[PDB]
Symmetry: C4
Subunit: 154 residues, 4 copies
């Protein structure tokens, strides 16, 4: 617990909020010496809905984890590019990132569907060019770290 | 005080000078273990006016702090892009960055207005493409640091 | 052996798999003080063939080392760019990276030829834009490290 | 002397060779605590002439130091961009970087003139796109370091 860090980048908007934070990979120590990557690193996204003016319901939050490759998708997006990721379970989630009309930003939307319970939720947060540039730059910085490549240093 | 660092990037021009330097975020240590970001990091800009040939008046300086998102705005600017940031108080400040005619650089201008005292100041510094490229590269380097994301490392 | 790190980025596809990992340079310590780069750093690529559905034959793997300059070639590639590297021995190897039809990714192909033994092998792995973006970002991160330039720090 | 590092990036060509290496800034420690940048950092270029097939004369080398701003110029260069830097003394030096005909690389040329002694030297090294990409990526990595901004970290 001593090694925990909390420093999300968060964007609060009218209908919902979104936060992003890296999760580092885990490594296994080898008997013969050295380490080897174990559990993958991700960039974790958290979405939660507004319930009023500048008020949000943290209890209804839903998460979506971006793999290294999914981060690669996001950082290579141009002004007018779109993408969608589908994660299989019961509950199915999908994350879409689509440009706004003006190319002055995007809509980032998390869909959460439980067909069995007929429950259906969607959390959408607009992000400006400036905000998405923070995401690209920060996620690009984090990528080598979530891949474990920061361990290759002189 | 032992941890202070002074290493501004500065540009000195005919009517004014400008300097830029990161300010790191502060963190709070958690009782249960780990840390959490407290006070935001910024890139601090300082402007001061010329009073003669290669002479400037440091006593009349005025500051403007760039948030992570405002840095995102600056680093994603193309050759012909413009931007303006407004900071509310009494005294109101605004920062504009506009391309020059030739697309060989920009004008970075700080406006400081105190309507009550009818005082009105403006400090403008031209910056070349090369100088703005230093800013983009350096501010991009600093961004993960002012966000606290440098704490996520293996 | 205590300093070994294993954290490849790997892409598994229908006919073959590919993995990439940096190899750091070696340095020599100088009698008068300080260090000087000795053996070059590279980004090592490993290719091996499929033998069935999600099954591959590690025993038939073949390697190809990218120099700093060859990494420079890869990271500066645009969507529609191609490249080929030839490495002299007996056995000759060549590595090609060519865009797919749609510009939605590339084919990375390792050729291994032994004219004397008339043996002839080729291992080809398709990589998406997102996967190649991971490679560009990660290899760019690693470049200063494999060059030894990470040693120039305050 | 214990802190010296030697790890140039070097390009050897038909008529001349060129090497590049960062030089870190110096800092002064403050009585009240903390440090402040003193002597500027640069990227140092070294050129020397060929005297035969894969043979060069190190004794006739000439140097040229790139300031942070001059590095900004280099890293922001597009395929078809040119630049020239002039350094005043006695001896005057100028450094030009011009694209080749095909946009497949550049010519980097150091001029050294001593009008008084009527001595006149020029050392020119062609650099491929891949080689210049190493320079851009490596110099961009080094820039925050030569500016002293690597000292702003959590």
């Amino acid at each position: 617990r001593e090694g925990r860090v909390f420093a999300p980048y968060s964007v609060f908007k009218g209908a919902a909020a979104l936060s992003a934070e890296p999760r580092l990979p885990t490594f296994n120590r080898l008997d013969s010496g050295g380490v080897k990557l174990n559990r993958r690193g991700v960039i974790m996204l958290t979405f939660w809905p507004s319930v009023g003016e500048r008020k949000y319901d943290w209890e209804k939050r839903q998460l979506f984890a971006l793999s290294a490759t999914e981060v690669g998708s996001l950082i290579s997006m141009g002004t007018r590019d779109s993408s969608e990721f589908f994660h299989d379970p019961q509950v199915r989630k999908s994350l879409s990132i689509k440009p706004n009309a003006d190319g002055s930003g995007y809509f980032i939307s998390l869909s959460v569907v439980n067909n069995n319970l007929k429950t259906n939720d969607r959390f959408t947060v607009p992000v400006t060019t400036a905000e998405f540039a923070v995401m690209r730059t920060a996620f690009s910085f984090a990528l080598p770290h979530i891949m474990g490549w920061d361990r290759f240093t002189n």
